[PDB]
């Protein structure tokens with residue numbers, strides 16, 4: 001298992017514009033297009049992202065390309081963030097994947113906000129960080145996905161994703 005396979009499981013793959021869990025226009029593998037309520041604005045951001053007149057539909061190759069860009073950006077956002085970088089550097093390879101997943105979902109800003117949890121992860125207090133991560137809107141709104149990510153932080157293994 002790896003970060004790409006992990007996120008492909010959590011986000012799924014859709015080739016036509018759809019609405020995410022928050023009701024925002026998205027496409028591909030969890031690629032947020034716009035927070036705006038307008039489908040046109042969404043089609044416009046899609047075309048600009050792909051570089052062609054899409055008609056709200058993309059191919060698999062195009063979806064994967066946005067995905068690759070998005071994972072790359074997630075990583076870079078972590079390494080440039082004063083609060084995230086040190087956590088990420090302190091973690092083992094499996095747990096780093098869990099942090100990337102959170103950033104991909106909620107953005108760097110969002111994750112950097114989990115101050116207490118971050119400190120606990122940095123300290124390697126797994127069970128305690130897991131309980132603290134669960135006390136969040138994130139966990140209450142997307143519980144199955146949050147449980148998966150939290151279990152990875154708790155155990156350092158990919159067991160939570162094996163079966164899916």
Ligand SMILES: [Cl-]
Nearest residue numbers: 048049066069
């Ligand atoms: Cl883009």
Ligand SMILES: [Cl-]
Nearest residue numbers: 142143144145
């Ligand atoms: Cl969920």
